[PDB]
Structures are given as C-alpha cells and as structure tokens.
Design a protein around this ligand. Structure first.
Ligand SMILES: CC(=O)[C@H]1CC[C@H]2[C@@H]3CC=C4C[C@@H](OS(=O)(=O)O)CC[C@]4(C)[C@H]3CC[C@]12C
Ligand SMILES: CC(=O)N[C@@H]1[C@@H](O)[C@H](O)[C@@H](CO)O[C@H]1O
Ligand SMILES: CC(=O)N[C@@H]1[C@@H](O)[C@H](O)[C@@H](CO)O[C@H]1O
Ligand SMILES: CC(=O)N[C@@H]1[C@@H](O)[C@H](O)[C@@H](CO)O[C@H]1O
Ligand SMILES: CC(=O)N[C@@H]1[C@@H](O)[C@H](O)[C@@H](CO)O[C@H]1O
Ligand SMILES: CC(=O)N[C@@H]1[C@@H](O)[C@H](O)[C@@H](CO)O[C@H]1O
Ligand SMILES: CC(=O)N[C@@H]1[C@@H](O)[C@H](O)[C@@H](CO)O[C@H]1O
Ligand SMILES: CC(=O)N[C@@H]1[C@@H](O)[C@H](O)[C@@H](CO)O[C@H]1O
Ligand SMILES: CC(=O)N[C@@H]1[C@@H](O)[C@H](O)[C@@H](CO)O[C@H]1O
Ligand SMILES: CC(=O)N[C@@H]1[C@@H](O)[C@H](O)[C@@H](CO)O[C@H]1O
Ligand SMILES: CC(=O)N[C@@H]1[C@@H](O)[C@H](O)[C@@H](CO)O[C@H]1O
Ligand SMILES: CCCCCCCCCCCC
Ligand SMILES: CCCCCCCCCCCC
Ligand SMILES: CCCCCCCCCC
Ligand SMILES: CCCCCCCCCC
Ligand SMILES: CCCCCCCCCC
Ligand SMILES: CCCCCCCCCC
Ligand SMILES: CCCCCCCCCC
Ligand SMILES: CCCCCCCCCC
Ligand SMILES: CCCCCCCC
Ligand SMILES: CCCCCCCC
Ligand SMILES: CCCCCCCC
Ligand SMILES: CCCCCCCC
Ligand SMILES: CCCCCCCC
Ligand SMILES: CCCCCCCC
Ligand SMILES: CCCCCCCC
Ligand SMILES: CCCCCCCC
Ligand SMILES: CCCCCCCC
Ligand SMILES: CCCCCCCC
Ligand SMILES: CCCCCCCC
Ligand SMILES: CCCCCC
Ligand SMILES: CCCCCC
Ligand SMILES: CCCCCC
Ligand SMILES: CCCCCC
Ligand SMILES: CCCCCC
Ligand SMILES: [Cl-]
Lengths: 333, 333, 333, 333, 333
C-alpha cells in the first residue's frame, strides 16, 4: 500500500508542522484562467483561477531508491495537514468537481509538498460612476489565512512578481483589462492579532467612442437644428412653431432612451449634466419666439424687416453653447 | 494526539454545561463585512458578517506547563456541544466553505472556548413607499437561540454597544447607510416559553436631487410651456393648437417613462400625485382655447383685441399652480 | 449518556408505534412566519412556516425522580421513527440549516414527543385573470402523509381552528391578504387507498384605485378631448385635422405602455375591452370630419353655418359613451 | 428487527433477479401532477409526476402467518436492487426531500415489489415558429433504462393506455393542453445494443383572438385611415400631408411595440409578413399625393376638379388590399 | 459476492496500472446530445454529451467459463482507478443523478474496462461582433487530464474522426450550426510538463434576412421619403417643414428601438454605421430647405420658378446615397 510508506498513524496531523517553534513559510502561485462576468448594479466580478501552495513537512518523508515522486488525489486531504486559505470580501465560491474533485497532491522524497486546486470566486469591488462614461475603475482580489496568525504561518509570494500569470485570451465584452500586478499588506484583527494578506490588482477602462457617438451626437444635432429656426421670417407663423415644438419632443425621447440604456445607478453622472443643459437650450429657443410674436402684434394695434431679438440671438446662442462645451470638457477632461 | 488531552470519551456532550443548575451565559460579538444587495419588490437585503461566541466549560480543561492555547478546525465541532444560534425572519443563509469550512475553535487551558464562523444571511424587511422618493426605511437583523429557553441559555452582548464593528467601505448603489446600533429584547413563544433576542439596526436614505431633477423638472417646464400659449393672438389659428396638443404628448411620454423606470410597486406614491395633477393643468389649457375659438366665431355670425378669457387666464393659472406647489411641499416636507 | 436511558437497541424503530393494531393519532400545529413572494406568470407563491407534530410512543419512556424533559437535536432523528409529512402540489422546498439543522426534539418522561422544524415551501395556485384588475384569487396549502394510509396514521388538527397562528407583520407589496382558515378533507389514491389531507386557506385582493387612475383616466380624457373638436368651425381646415390625428397617437402610446407594464398573460382581460373600445371612438371622430369636408366641397363646385352632422354628433357621441360605460360597469361590477 | 426477516446478507444484490436467464419484466405507471412552466426561447418545459415500478424478486420473500405487507422508507434502497430508470433528452432533474426522501418501498409476502417516488424533470422540445401565432407544437417525455439492454431488462406499460393519469386542474397561463397518450418504440445504441423507450405525448395551442385583436386590428385601421385621405380636396395642401405623414409614425410605433412584446425568435414569422406589407401600403399613399401636387404645379407655370390619379386610386387601393388579405389567409389558414 | 471475484483487497488502487513503465493509452468517445443555450453578453454556451473511456487493467481480470461481462453501478468507482478527465476553460458542470447516478462500468474477462457517464458542461467562447449581423463565430470544447502528464497517461481519439457523433435534431433558436470535427494538440505547463488536449469544433451563423428587413428597410424608406420633399413648390411653406421634421422623429424612434432590441455589446458594430450615416442624410435635407427659404426672402426685400439649389439637390443626394451603399456593401461584403 502506498499510504503505508507514509507513517500516517504514527504522527498527529491536527497540528501544524514545527509546532511550538518558528513559523512554517508557505508560498503561493496564482494563474488566472478567465474573467467570467462583471455586474455594475451589485458591484462584483467573477474570476476563475488556479491556486498553488508550497511548504515543507518532514513527517511525510519516505525512503526510496530514486527521486521519483508520488501523486495522490483529493482523498488524501482529510488525512494530512494543509493550509486553510480563504478569499476575503467574497460573496460565494466553489471548487469544480467534474468528473472528480480538482485537487492534486505531489510529495517529494525529502518532504516537499505541492497543493494545487481549481476555484471560482465572486468578490466585491467598490465603484464610482460620477465621471461616466469617462470613469476608470480599480478592483482587487485578496487571499489570507483564516485561523493562523503571523506567529504560526508566514505567507508570501514564492517568486515575487513572477508568481502571477494570466491567459492570453482574457477579455471582457464592455471593458478593457490591463496592469496586472501583485502587492502585500499586513492586516490587524483585535480578536487574534496580525495577519499577512496578498493582493491581485488590475484596472478597467471603457470604449469612449461608442458612448460619445450615441449620446452626444444627437443632442448637438438637435441643438443646432433648433438654432436654425432663427433665420426664417417671422411672418410665416405656421411655419416656425412646428420646428421648435418638435425639437423638444425629440430631445425628450433621446433622454428617455439614454436613461433606459444606462445601468440603474441613482445619482448624477457626467452624462446627465450634458443632456439636461442641452434641454434648456432647446426650451429657451421656443420662449424667444413667443416674445418676438407678442411684441410684433402690439405694434400693429398701436400703429393702427428683421427684429433685433433675432439678430442678437443668432450671435448669443452659439457663443453660450461653445463656452459651455469648453468649460464642460475642461472640467471632465 | 491532541484530542486525547481533552477527555472526549470521559464526558457526555449531548447536554449543556452545568446541567440542572444556573444557565450558562453566552456572549456574542458581530463584525459586519459588507451589504451585498437590497431588493425593493421582494423587500429583503443580504449581509455578510462574522459571528463569534464566548462561553466557559470546565469539561474541556487540560493540563499544561505554560499558557498556550490549542486551535481546532471544523472537524471538532461535531464532537462537543455548541450553541444553536439562528437568524429569525430570514429567507436563506449558508456558511462559506472555500477552500474549507470557515470554522475556528480556540480552547484556553482554564476552559474558556471561542467559536467563530463566517456566514451570509438574507432577511426580510417591511418597507413603505407612500412617500417615495422622500421615504425613510428602517431595517433590522435578529439573532435568537432555537431550542434553549432563558432558563438554560442566557444570551447577551459581551461588551454592550462596543460589541458591533463595521467595515470602512460598506456602501450601497442607491442608498445611504448610517446609524448602526444594537438593542436587546425578550420574545415569547406560547409553545415553550421565553427567549432572549438581539437586534442590529440601521437606517436608509436616498439621493433626493437625482429624482428631483429627472421627475419634477420636465413636468414644470411643460406646464410653463403650456402657459406660454395664452400670449399668442387668437387669429393665428394654425399656430396655437399645435403647442397645446403637443404638450400633452410630451407629458404622456414623460409619465410613461417615469412609470417604467420606477420599481413595480402597485399603490399611489407621492410622485404619482404630482405628475397626474400637472397633466390636468396641461389638459385644461387646451379646452380654454376651444371656448375662445367658439365664442369668437359666434360673434362673427351674429354681426354678419384680446378676449377677456385670455386676460383672466394669464393671472389665474400661475396663482393656482403656485398654491398647489405650496400645499404639496408643505404636506410632504 | 442520555441515549442510554432510552433503550435504543432494545426496540425496532423501522415500524410504527402500535404496529398491527389501531392507528396512531398525530396532531399538527402550524405558525405562518412570512410570505416571501408571488409570481403571476407561473402561478405560485412562497411561504415560510413552523411545523409541529404530537404523538405518543411508549418505547421512549424513561424513569425519573421528577417531571423534567430531555431536549435532543437533529442527530437523534435518524435513530427513531418520525412521521413523514410532505406538501402536495409543491414545486420546491428545503429545511434551513444555519448555523445548524433547525430541528428540535423533546421527550416527556411518560413518552409524549414533540417534533418541531422550520421549512420553506413553494406551492402552486391556479389563477384566473379574466376580470383583471377587479379579480379575487383564493390559494391554499396542503399537508398530507406520504406512505401511511388512514388505516395506519390518523392526521388531524390538534386544537381545531386555534391551531393556526399568523405573524402580525405579514404583508405583500401588491396584494391584500385576509381570511386565514383551516379545513380537512379525505383523498383517494388508486394505488394504496384513502388519506387524510389538511388545508390552509387565504384570499388575495388588489388596490383598485391605482389601476383605475393609471389605466382609465387618460383614456376618458382623450375621448373627451376628441369630442371637443366638434365645436371648431369647419373652415379652419389646418386647425382641426391635427387634433384628431394627434389624439390617436397619444391613445396608441397609452395602450402600448399599459400592455408593457402589465404581466404577460396572453388572453383577453377586462381592462383590454375598455381600452380597445375607446380606440374606436377616437377613430370614428376623424372619419366624421372627412364626411363633412367632402360634402362641403361638393356644394362649392355645384354652386360655382353649422353642418347638420356636427349638430347630431354633439348629442350622439356622449350618449353612446355613457351607455357603454353603464353597461360595462354593470357587467363587471 | 424488520430487516432480519429478509436475508439481506445471504444474497448478492449487485446482480439483477433471474441473472443468467430470461429478462425480468418491469411495469411502469405514471401520474402527472402539474406543468410548471414553458420556455419558448430555450425550447423546454417542466413537469412533475409520480413514477411507479412493478417487478418480482424471489429473494425478498418472507414467511408470514397472514398477507400483510411490509412498508419501508428510502433507507432500504441502498441494500437491494432497483431499476435504474432515467429520463432521455433532459436538462436537469431532482427528487423532493421534504420533510424526508419521497421514496416508498412495499414488499408482498410472495415477493412482489412496489417502488414509488416523486420527481421533477425538465426536458427539451424543439419548436417551430414559422406560423406564429397560428402554430401547433408537439412535445414528449421519454423514459429508458440506462445500463440494461432488452436482453436483461424488459420495460413496458403495465396497463396499456390506462397507465397514464392526469390531474384535473393542470393548465398553463398562455397555452391549451390536450391529447395525452402513450406509445412505445425500440432504440439502438452502437456501443451496447437495443433498448426499450416509453413516450408521453401531448399537444399545445394558443389563444388566437388575443393576438388577432392586438396585432391585426390597429394595422387594418391605420391602412383604412390612410385610404381616407384620398377624398380631401387637393387645394388644402396643409391639411393632407399631415395625415399621411402621421399614419407612418403610428404604424412604426405599433410595429416596434409588437416586436418588443413578442419572444426573441430571430427569423421571419407569419405575423411579421402582414405588418411590413401594411407598412408599404401606408408609404405609397404619401408618394401618391406628391405626384398629384407636382403635376398640378406643372400646369400652373405652363398656362401662366378631381385629378385622375385620385379617381383611380380610390378603386385600386382597396382591391389590392382585399386580394392580399385573401391570399394571405388562404396560405396561412 | 460479485466483488469477491475481483481481488480488491489484494491490490493497491491508488496507483495507475503498469506503474513505473510505459504510459497506459486511454481512448475517448463523445456523443453530443443537445445544445441548451448560448449567451452573447457573457460569451458562453451549454452542452450535454456522453463521455466514454477505454483502457486495459490486468488486476480486474477474473476467471470465467464463458465470455459474459459484469456490469456495475457507480458504487464501484470509489474502489478502483479511473481517469480524471476535466473540461478546460469551463464555468460550471455537473453529472446527472436521477433516478440514480448515471455512471456505468463494464469489465471484460480479459481485463478491458468501459467507463461511461452523462455530463452537462458550460464553457466559454470568445466572440467578436465587429461585423454584426453578418458575423461568423467559432467555438470549441476541450478535454484534458488533470494530474497525469504525457509520460504516464496518453490520451487520444479511439477511432479518429469517427469518434464524434451528433444527434439528428440538434439546433438553436437563433443560430445555424455546422462543421463538426475533432483535432488534437499538445499543451505545456511550466509546473509539471506537457499534456494532451482534445478539441471539438463547430461554427455558428445567423439569419441574414430577418435583420436585413427589420433594420435596413425602414432606414432606406425614410431616406427616400425625405428625398421626396424636393419636388414640392417652395411657396407651400407650411407643407414641407412638417415632412422634414417628422422624418427625423421616425428615424430617431427606429434607432432607439434597434438599440433596445440588440444585445448590450458596448462597441461600434457594422449595423450602427449604417443607421447613423442615414440619420445625417435626413438631417441635411432640413438644412437645405432653410437656405432656399432664406435666399428667397432676401430677394423679395431687396427687389421691393425653381431655385437652383433644389435642381442640384435632386441629382446630388441620390448619387451620394448610392455611392455610400456601394462602398458600405463592398467593405462588409
Ligand atoms: C408627434 C406629434 O404629435 C407631432 C410631430 C410633428 C407634428 C406636426 C408638425 C406640423 C404640423 C402642421 C400644422 O399645420 S400648419 O399648416 O399650420 O403648418 C398642423 C400641426 C402639425 C400636423 C403637427 C401635429 C403634431 C405632430 C404630428
Ligand atoms: C539531486 C538529487 O536528488 N539527486 C539524487 C541522487 O542523490 C540519488 O543518488 C539518485 C538515486 O537514483 O536520485 C537523484
Ligand atoms: C514586490 C514587487 O516587486 N512588486 C512590484 C510592484 O511594486 C510594481 O508596481 C508592479 C508593477 O507595476 O510589479 C510588482
Ligand atoms: C495569568 C496567567 O494565566 N498566568 C500563568 C501563570 O500562572 C503560569 O505560572 C505560567 C506558566 O508558564 O503561565 C501564565
Ligand atoms: C445598551 C446600550 O447602551 N444601547 C445603546 C442604545 O440605547 C443607543 O440608542 C445606541 C446609539 O444610539 O447605542 C447603544
Ligand atoms: C402531574 C405530574 O406529572 N406530577 C408529577 C408527580 O406525580 C411526581 O411525584 C413528581 C416528582 O417530582 O413530578 C410531578
Ligand atoms: C373545523 C372548523 O371549526 N372549521 C372552521 C371553518 O368552518 C370556518 O369557515 C373557519 C372560519 O371561517 O374557521 C374554522
Ligand atoms: C389470496 C391469498 O393470498 N390468500 C391468503 C390465504 O391463502 C392465507 O391462508 C391467508 C392467511 O391469513 O392469507 C390470505
Ligand atoms: C398501445 C395503445 O393502445 N396505444 C394507444 C394509441 O395508439 C392511441 O393513439 C392513443 C389515443 O389516441 O391511445 C393509446
Ligand atoms: C474470442 C473469444 O473470446 N472466444 C471465447 C472462447 O475462446 C472460449 O472458449 C468461449 C467459452 O465459452 O468463450 C468465447
Ligand atoms: C485526425 C483527422 O482525421 N482529422 C480530420 C480533420 O483534419 C478534418 O479537418 C476534419 C473535417 O474537416 O475531419 C477530421
Ligand atoms: C457647436 C459645438 C462646438 C463643440 C466644440 C468642442 C470644443 C472641444 C474643446 C476641447 C478642449 C480640450
Ligand atoms: C398598391 C399600389 C397602388 C398604386 C396606385 C397607382 C395608381 C396609378 C394611376 C395612374 C392613372 C394615370
Ligand atoms: C466615431 C466618432 C464619432 C464622433 C461623433 C462626434 C461627437 C462630438 C461630441 C461633441
Ligand atoms: C452671423 C452669424 C454668426 C454665426 C457664428 C457666431 C459666432 C460664433 C463664434 C462666437
Ligand atoms: C382616486 C383616483 C381617481 C382616478 C379617476 C377615476 C376615473 C374613473 C372613471 C373611469
Ligand atoms: C378585408 C377583410 C377580408 C377578410 C377575408 C377573409 C377570407 C378568408 C378566406 C379563408
Ligand atoms: C426620388 C423619388 C421622389 C419622387 C417624387 C415624385 C416624382 C414624380 C415624377 C412624375
Ligand atoms: C431630373 C430628375 C432625375 C430623377 C432621376 C435621378 C437619378 C440619379 C441617379 C444618380
Ligand atoms: C428668451 C426670452 C427673451 C425675452 C427678451 C425680452 C426683451 C424685451
Ligand atoms: C462638477 C459640476 C460641473 C458642471 C459644469 C457646468 C458648466 C456650466
Ligand atoms: C388622493 C389622490 C388624489 C389624486 C388626484 C389625481 C388627479 C385627479
Ligand atoms: C414653487 C414654490 C416652492 C416653495 C417650496 C416651499 C417648501 C416649504
Ligand atoms: C360615423 C361616421 C360618419 C357618418 C356620416 C354619415 C353620412 C350620411
Ligand atoms: C370618408 C367617406 C367618403 C365617402 C362619403 C360618402 C357620403 C355619401
Ligand atoms: C359612471 C356610472 C357608474 C355606474 C356604476 C354602477 C355600479 C353597479
Ligand atoms: C381581420 C380578418 C380576420 C380573418 C379571420 C381569420 C380567422 C382564422
Ligand atoms: C468607424 C467609423 C465610424 C463612422 C461614424 C460616422 C458617423 C456620422
Ligand atoms: C447639397 C447640394 C449643394 C449644391 C450647391 C449648388 C449651388 C449652385
Ligand atoms: C443598392 C446597391 C447594392 C450594391 C450591392 C453590391 C453587392 C456586392
Ligand atoms: C437671448 C436673447 C437676447 C435678446 C437681447 C435683446
Ligand atoms: C376652462 C373652461 C372655461 C369656460 C369659460 C366659459
Ligand atoms: C353621427 C352620425 C350623424 C348622421 C346624421 C345624418
Ligand atoms: C446643406 C446645404 C447648404 C447649402 C448652403 C448654400
Ligand atoms: C441657415 C441658412 C444660412 C444661409 C447663409 C447663406
Ligand atoms: Cl394655414
């Protein structure tokens, strides 16, 4: 029997190796396989990865006439001591079990142990949509021991920044992923003490042009169309009102559609400011004509060319819109 | 074997410590990790937290030459007695088990025991939307023993108010969370007797301005645009009907969009009252012009400036709208 | 050991108590904790409740010097005989297991047993939406034994009508719940025979006014607005067609929005009759003006005031609409 | 002990009864409890039913002084041999386990065995939407042994057609269900050989009138409304363009709403053909007027009643639409 | 006992057959049963298939007087050595267990073993929608051993290309599936070494005409309708503005509907280019009329037929649109 080469019954595996002395160093190697999905309403992302652990345990040493290693399946995990890593700030996770448990153990003759497994984890990530759609989001994934403090277990990356590998085909439907790097930081819990924590960081960016076209182009086009009505003669009363009254309806439909398409984030964003300012510029154009029409009628009654209001509007409106655009794109870059 | 130091087979662990005498005091410490999501239609929320228990049992005392404690994993839980806490008025819950069970046991030489575990719980919370979007919601989370009454298990907060801790980065997409505090109360069941119950309370608020702009601003703008038609000469018949008839369509589209965007709660809210009153004001303007056009025509037939009705309307309509706004915002603050 | 006081190994627990003789009566108590959600498309509802069983077993009697009882957790269930209740016409159900199994057992010295557990169940309920939104629905939940007929197990409510208790804070978002009561009935299966079945009944209602306002108010307003066009002089040709042609579009958008907001039930409902009848009234108003315009044009050519059609329409249309409203509200109450 | 009457340890239960000789005949009875839901996009349905098996085993015979039978729960299944039935072309299935396993075993003294259990299954069913909403779908559910061929296990319906029973209150929200019947057929697998397969067949139909009204009524109404414009004098130029240009908008909105409400099936259906042909008729009415206006204008310049085009159109358009309707309803019945 | 024919306790089954020698060849057969669904947002697909293994082990050889084989259920898998296959780049998977585990084991007298099981797997597939709706997508499913390298386990298709079978009725609601074939390739991991991988490839196509009609046809029709306005006399000022202003609204509604119906892929597709270029053509037609009306008024004031702009537009606009169509359909084929 292979398990008889390891003195399983002659050793206690309920305690850590090197009990009562210096901590046992444990190395971790992570390989990212894919990114499944990201949810903006609930602010979470899903990841699939390979997790590996390295440590040395002298109780598992077995004699041999060569350097061949022995491979065991997941059934040996319950009989020996293994590190209990867990993911912080996670919502749910599981280990794949098709067609059997995806757990592997490899033991060297001296006693070096390799522990590999495949896991899928969902983690939280705080997001800020103030600068939508020009926003940049940074998320992270954290790994930490559960029950052992730094006095008993010393956790670290095995090969520095070479311990993180990513698949060549990792991609998202609506985001750009870049800048994968690893950091470490000590965390404190008042109940037990100090712990070591490992981080995996990355950054997300959007496709600016798609939002630019769809949102901003119709708004500017409709504003210019509303401007155009200033060059039509005032005497054609049933030929100037329809343009102004039919620009507002189109703007309202555009706003409703854009609101429907965007994610349900309930606070003011950068896109909302642009759309509601443009709505006022269209609204004021109709108010301008009512004043012109009213003043003309008063003169006719009193007494019985181009009005100066139109001349001033043709210059004032484009300047105001250009100044607003300059300020808006200077603030939001 | 570390389990041989504790006389597991020399004691019965089917009964609480100190059976037949005074109840064993059990303290609870809770640290909130995050709020996952909140549902308005189903009226529930999801929370992730750490749960810790403190109690003393002399049967677990073991001799030692120093003050060191022994740490055990989740496999020892089934061999000893632990309190059976559960969350009242919950819909679903589970304990995280990646990469293994998130259960820790720590035993002091004197006999003090620490039992910590990590759990996610979904709980119900009644909500009132009569004052939407100016509503305030209060939700609570409750903990209680299942099978032991107050005569057997005395449940209390270990450090009073200081037993609750919260994360620094806990937030919600569409709500503001504040006022975390803890209270206790006795609960009675006719079948078995009295129980001790613990509470965790918090309050939720919305972002007023986002709803204010989106909902209220277009309605007021359309009402003013409808008022504008009172200043146009009545002789321009195909230049005054379009304004009135195209304000109604815009108002209807705005109402439909707002209803679509809001949650599907089927009773009258504070927002719905405002929108449907404004619709009537737009509707009454159209009828007013129909009366003027009819009366003016009758004069032409009988016989073969500005009409009094328009002069009165110009003053009557804004005063009524201002009075309605004052009363509405006085009632709903 | 507590399990040694009960002669577990001296009795056979694969057979019911009193085997070979009269049936064992079992009492049932139910307390409804909350109603989670209801689905109209799939016609089912979710409930959380407490289930309690009472029966007498002489094999569990143990001597004592007093009248104290012993409380056991769920690990003893597998060693004794317990009734196998199940829910009829259910879709899915489970027993909560946080932080451990929610099962309690209490045994009296004489031999009376109490078996309580906490369960969440989803059950089906047929619904009829012919009279929406004036419909009333009756749903029920049924409890029955699985393998034992009435010859072996006699199931009944322990305290008659007083065996059902409901929480004070049970409510639904879009329905009103009332009239909780319990009944019993015999059922027959050809495979084994008769069974006793228990019922829990309740009724549901809607908020009439919310649907009334939203659906019916705009339709009536648009119909009256279409009527208003009869009082405009026929000579204002480009001032009367737009009103009629713009009422149809508003009515169509209202109908589309109503259909969108409604649940996806694909057969004729009461509200659909009202809306599509009003669409005919709006459609006929446009055709009425076309007949007037054509006849006027014929006279002008032939030869080279208020037309009778308008005068008759002003009286005919409101009377027909009032008659339709009276009949419709008499049929559907 | 009840299990000691049956010589469990004296027989090998890893082999089928009558091993080495003729196959054991197994009968099947099915009772349908309810139909849960149907998914048109994924083309599958969910059903709940009772499954019963009948077979004879001499190894389970026990002596008795009477003819009473012994009933066991699911804990005896793991010690004896039972048929390994499974559902073909299924996606997911499970057995209900509240408050315990819904498995029953009954043994007659001679050796007859009954095996009943309650199971919920989701199965695939290909659908064709070419003739929507006048389409008819046929679905089926199949039962077959997994490991035993026809040489070792012979499967058949116990009571012919009378083996299928349906609940009185089975129905669907949007479909009509009828024609339940059962058939059998042999299946071949090259890896192992021949197998027996059992079928349960039914047919589905829709509500024609709900779709008829909703879709077809507005399209015909708008087409007739567009026809109406042919009777208005050509000189009323700003009274004839609006009708034609506002009918196209209503038609487009109706088409968009209908497409949104219907299921997302991405190929041409019978309803789509009717709506787009009606869109062409409304479109051509606008072009017809432009030709009339241009030709009249041509004469005015050259030189300086009712045009023939209107007279011919008034007859040509209705005849073409009637012919299209006749052909369409002849092809699609 | 059947398990006593195989010397289970006389051999160690924690090591592969022929340990220390040449690699053991394992053959694989796959039969595809159905394709459940496909998700374009998350870029994945679900498949149900049969998996079969072939290998030879002398330790399972048993004496016999004939060539009959013994069939075992899933309970024997835990006692012998079986290959640990797993699916690469998968998100979730499970093995069906109704009414029991769908695992079959067959052993020949000489020692040949057959291992079949039924599994459902969800796998990722990268998609590119740059050419929507005329895109072509290729997906694959990959199988690989987990813990054994090529030095110990050699994986291959048993009968080459003939080892893949597909059901006769496999189809998708909105895709066309074709070109099933199999390949092999070696993969390298730096942790352990080379591995063998197996592939299953297929291709998906859409229904061109459904998207063609719905999207493209209304855009072309509206562009031609906007072209129509060039043939109407300029003096009919309130007879051309409504047409131009009502084409833009229809185009906007069509674009909004198309955006709503399409999957939420956030980058520019081939469909978006066509719709927004057409929207510009409609916009320019309105501005063209503004120049005509302005210049005409200038002449009347200064001084106190068909303008050249219309004459040039009648030829310029259709030619530009035809050139754009030719280029667009040349680039995107
Ligand atoms: C969707 C809507 O509801 C709007 C969108 C475009 C609008 C039209 C634009 C121009 C005109 C011409 C005018 O006649 S006139 O001789 O006085 O010019 C009468 C009014 C009419 C028919 C409008 C009616 C309302 C609309 C259909
Ligand atoms: C670096 C190392 O481990 N070398 C060993 C060597 O010492 C040993 O003699 C041999 C036995 O075959 O296996 C190898
Ligand atoms: C321990 C270590 O080398 N950490 C570095 C980190 O400082 C750097 O930011 C990153 C790439 O930017 O690569 C890694
Ligand atoms: C407060 C306390 O527990 N103090 C103890 C002390 O009494 C004991 O002698 C010592 C043994 O190392 O451990 C510590
Ligand atoms: C037992 C106790 O101290 N309870 C208090 C509670 O009364 C108070 O409301 C809360 C903060 O408001 O802090 C805690
Ligand atoms: C009603 C009842 O059960 N009474 C009993 C009594 O008979 C018994 O003597 C006593 C022992 O302490 O416990 C109590
Ligand atoms: C057995 C019994 O008392 N049943 C009654 C039932 O008849 C009655 O309808 C209900 C309240 O209405 O209360 C209960
Ligand atoms: C048809 C049948 O099984 N009849 C039996 C009968 O032979 C037997 O004597 C009796 C014993 O009580 O039970 C019954
Ligand atoms: C074996 C047998 O009797 N099968 C019949 C089948 O032929 C018939 O079609 C169905 C009802 O139509 O009833 C059953
Ligand atoms: C090809 C093969 O396996 N043939 C065998 C034959 O050698 C053997 O004598 C017989 C026993 O019945 O079974 C068969
Ligand atoms: C090993 C082998 O024969 N592979 C072939 C592959 O090359 C070919 O492309 C496919 C059908 O196209 O059939 C298979
Ligand atoms: C009429 C619209 C004018 C738009 C002008 C855009 C100006 C962009 C300035 C960018 C500054 C970084
Ligand atoms: C359905 C298409 C109807 C087209 C009507 C054309 C009428 C042409 C009349 C020509 C008279 C000179
Ligand atoms: C593909 C780039 C489309 C750019 C549209 C113009 C946007 C102008 C925003 C002010
Ligand atoms: C006379 C019309 C001028 C149009 C452009 C106005 C100036 C733009 C830059 C301020
Ligand atoms: C209190 C809500 C009233 C809404 C108007 C009811 C109109 C009924 C006539 C259809
Ligand atoms: C305009 C409506 C004409 C309807 C004709 C229906 C004929 C059906 C033939 C089967
Ligand atoms: C480009 C299509 C526009 C057709 C307008 C009507 C032309 C009539 C010519 C007799
Ligand atoms: C003068 C009217 C010409 C109408 C046909 C124009 C066709 C242009 C094709 C480039
Ligand atoms: C936008 C309204 C302008 C009104 C100007 C009135 C100046 C007398
Ligand atoms: C942070 C708000 C920026 C708003 C810019 C408005 C410029 C007129
Ligand atoms: C108490 C609700 C009043 C709603 C009035 C809406 C306008 C008729
Ligand atoms: C339009 C007047 C608003 C006044 C608000 C007063 C709130 C107390
Ligand atoms: C109800 C449509 C108009 C009917 C006119 C009848 C003329 C004789
Ligand atoms: C729109 C109706 C036109 C035909 C009217 C016939 C009146 C006799
Ligand atoms: C507006 C008429 C209402 C009539 C209601 C009749 C109820 C029996
Ligand atoms: C509007 C035409 C109805 C034709 C009825 C056809 C019934 C199958
Ligand atoms: C990638 C080319 C996009 C061009 C968009 C043009 C919109 C007017
Ligand atoms: C868009 C066409 C412009 C043609 C200008 C010709 C000026 C004579
Ligand atoms: C209307 C232009 C169509 C061009 C088709 C080109 C096909 C290669
Ligand atoms: C914005 C309008 C300006 C008019 C100045 C008289
Ligand atoms: C709003 C209607 C006014 C009528 C005055 C006679
Ligand atoms: C409403 C129809 C009136 C007809 C009068 C002759
Ligand atoms: C868009 C056409 C403009 C022409 C100006 C002369
Ligand atoms: C908006 C029309 C401007 C024309 C300038 C020549
Ligand atoms: Cl006019």
């Amino acid at each position: 029997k292979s398990e008889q080469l390891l003195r399983i019954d002659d050793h206690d595996f309920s305690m850590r190796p090197g009990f009562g002395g210096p901590a046992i160093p444990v190395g971790v190697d992570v390989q990212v396989e894919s990114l499944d999905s990201i949810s903006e309403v609930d602010m979470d992302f899903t990841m699939t990865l390979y997790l590996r652990h390295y440590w040395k345990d002298e109780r598992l040493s077995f004699p041999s006439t060569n350097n061949l290693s022995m491979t065991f399946d997941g059934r040996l995990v319950k009989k020996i001591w293994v590190p209990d890593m867990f993911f912080v700030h996670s919502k749910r996770s599981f280990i794949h079990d098709t067609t059997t448990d995806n757990v592997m153990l490899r033991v060297q003759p001296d006693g070096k142990v390799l522990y590999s497994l495949r896991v899928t984890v969902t983690a939280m990530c705080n997001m800020d949509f103030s600068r939508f759609p020009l926003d940049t989001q940074t998320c992270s994934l954290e790994i930490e021991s559960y029950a052992y403090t730094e006095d008993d277990l010393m956790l670290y990356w095995k090969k520095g920044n070479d311990s993180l590998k990513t698949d060549e085909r990792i991609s998202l439907s609506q985001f750009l992923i870049q800048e994968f790097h690893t950091t470490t930081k000590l965390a404190f819990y008042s109940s037990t003490g100090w712990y070591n924590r490992l981080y995996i960081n990355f950054t997300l960016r959007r496709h600016i042009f798609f939002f630019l076209l769809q949102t901003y182009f119709p708004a500017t086009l409709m504003v210019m169309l509303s401007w155009v009505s200033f060059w039509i003669d005032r005497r054609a009363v049933p030929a100037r009102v329809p343009l102004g009254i039919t620009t507002v309806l189109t703007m309202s439909t555009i706003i409703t559609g854009v609101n429907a398409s965007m994610p349900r984030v309930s606070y003011i964003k950068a896109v909302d400011i642009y759309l509601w300012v443009s709505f006022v510029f269209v609204f004021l154009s109709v108010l301008e004509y009512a004043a012109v029409n009213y003043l003309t009628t008063v003169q006719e009654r009193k007494e019985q060319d181009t009005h100066a209001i139109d001349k001033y509007s043709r210059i004032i409106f484009p300047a105001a819109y250009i100044l607003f655009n300059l300020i808006y794109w200077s603030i939001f870059s």
